[PDB]
Amino acid sequence: WXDTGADXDGXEW
């Protein structure tokens, strides 16, 4: 889960 980002609005999740 969340290979992008790991944040609701940060690094396109």
Ligand SMILES: *C(=O)CCCCCCCCC
């Ligand atoms: C997020 O949806 C998945 C995070 C876990 C990925 C594990 C990959 C390796 C399995 C052997």
